[PDB]
Design a protein around this nucleic acid. Structure first.
Ligand SMILES: [Zn+2]
Length: 66
DNA sequence: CAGTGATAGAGAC
DNA sequence: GTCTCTATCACTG
């Protein structure tokens, strides 16, 4: 079990990010963090990966329910 | 239960 | 005062 950590540490092949709320994918099958998957897919052009950070800003949450 | 697409908000200068 | 990037939500099988 354990998986080599995550056998092939889910590491953004685009920005090395290891921490992320969810993992995205690309029609090529390469693993990507949510930011690159969201930004890369929406922009379609290379991006200064220098924007990435090891800290993620926590936003609020629409407390659904009743 | 998990993942995707779409929209909106906040921060900095 | 304005722009941008990123995260979360809702929905479905
Ligand atoms: Zn990434």
């Amino acid at each position: 079990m354990k998986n080599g950590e995550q056998n092939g540490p889910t590491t953004c092949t685009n920005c090395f990010t290891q921490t992320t709320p969810v993992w995205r994918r690309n029609p090529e099958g390469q693993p990507l963090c949510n930011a690159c998957g969201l930004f890369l897919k929406l922009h379609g052009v290379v991006r200064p990966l220098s924007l990435k950070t090891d800290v993620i800003k926590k936003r609020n949450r629409n407390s659904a329910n009743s």
